[PDB]
Amino acid sequence: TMSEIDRIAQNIIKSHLETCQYTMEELHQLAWQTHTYEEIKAYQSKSREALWQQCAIQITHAIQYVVEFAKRITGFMELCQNDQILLLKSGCLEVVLVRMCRAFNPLNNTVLFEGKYGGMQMFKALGSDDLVNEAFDFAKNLCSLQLTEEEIALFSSAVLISPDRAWLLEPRKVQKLQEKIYFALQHVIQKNHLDDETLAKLIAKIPTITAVCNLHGEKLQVFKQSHPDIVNTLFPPLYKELFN
């Protein structure tokens, strides 16, 4: 039923419009404005614990918007609650990574962080250049496809609504919804790209997205080793719940 496909597509596009931490309007106003040398120096002067806390807050803020995104997708809320929780726990950060690309400047390799754009050197205190580098490499690569907001909306929803997540009780229902989303995305892409393989290129990035997010988990585990008190009493409660 084509009416169903269009209804699903329109619903996801609308949710995306209303639930990104940064609207296209706000990104347009920022126009790639970067942090000053003074601000960059301040970030570099922060202790590892202090900067990690700030990063956890920004990441949690973005994750909260992904939860709102999911709540407004009719098909997502039709899934059993157990699976809704599993999809969000396992994929919220992956959606944040896709969204981060909207707030990334591929010309100078900077990302929007705490209101302005900053390069990888702004995160020196994290002691995790590999995570920053992998995240930035993915963003630069996704930006090369010049995706429209509708395409990002649909692709991000497919990343979230993944039938392959471990422990799902009704994976087939997730699969059926994801198939409808990809069918819609395939058609939307026809309006903006000559390469009829764009969808294939996007689907091929799925493992990379997961790899970057798993690296985030790895870094957090080591940080927890050195600063367990910070994570349990200073990090945002949701961040602790999702990544313990």
């Binding site: 939860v67 949701l238 719940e241 999702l242």
Partner: peptide
């Protein structure tokens, strides 16, 4: 999943 559960239902 106390917090995630609360947000989902908020």
């Amino acid at each position: 999943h106390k917090i995630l559960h609360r947000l989902l239902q908020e």
